[PDB]
Amino acid sequence: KVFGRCELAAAMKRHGLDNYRGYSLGNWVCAAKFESNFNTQATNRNTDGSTDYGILQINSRWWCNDGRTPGSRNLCNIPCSALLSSDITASVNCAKKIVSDGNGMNAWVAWRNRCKGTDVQAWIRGCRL
Ligand SMILES: [Cl-]
Ligand code: NA
Ligand code: NA
């Protein structure tokens, strides 16, 4: 599924991401835009052999099991394919564990490089939330 911007903002809010660990909703929408272009089916392979999955590009070396990342942890205890669903619940629940692990949203490279320090509220402007 490819979300609209406000559609995704509304889904993220319903799932408790607004101000989760202090990160306003616009931060999450901005991260999703640049990680996946709002596409739940996005995948990208990394140089170390791990793969990133879904709207928030969650990595198989630490967070989910894709059966082909040796020595990987499965800290969200989910198959990585569950992160590609049109229902974002599994991605959101895993993202909550990631953002609580110490480094906050800096875990998402695109957030650090393209959202951090910008006016992220623009990502939810105009939306009926
Ligand atoms: Cl980047
Ligand atoms: Na893909
Ligand atoms: Na992989």
Resolution (A): 1.7
Q: Are 3 and 37 in contact (CB under 8 A)?
A: no
- Strands lying side by side in the sheet with 58-59: 43-45, 51-53, 58-59
Task: Name the catalytic one among 7, 48, 52, 66.
Answer: 52
82-121: string of b/e by CB count within 10 Å (b at 16+)?
A: bbbeeebebbbebbeebbeeeebbebbebbeeebbeeebe
In CATH terms, the fold of domain 1-129 is Lysozyme (1.10.530)
Contact residues for 27 (Cβ-Cβ < 8 A; gap 6+): 105, 111, 115, 120
Whether residue 101 is annotated as binding a ligand: the answer is yes
The token duo for 113 is 């490089």
- Per the annotation, the verdict on 7 as an active-site residue is no
Count of beta carbons in the 10 Å neighbourhood of residue 128: 6
d(CA 53, CA 79): 10
- Per the annotation, the verdict on 35 as an active-site residue is yes
What method did the depositors use to determine the structure?
A: X-ray
User: What's the CA-to-centroid distance between 81 and ligand 2, angstroms?
Assistant: 10
**How far, in whole angstroms, is CA 90 from its chain's centroid?**
10
User: What's the CA-to-centroid distance between 103 and ligand 2, angstroms?
Assistant: 27
Task: Name the catalytic one among 18, 35, 87, 119.
Answer: 35
d(CA 82, CA 74): 13
Helix intervals (H) in the chain? 5-14, 25-36, 89-99, 109-114
Angle at 26 between CA 23 and CA 27, to 5 degrees: 50
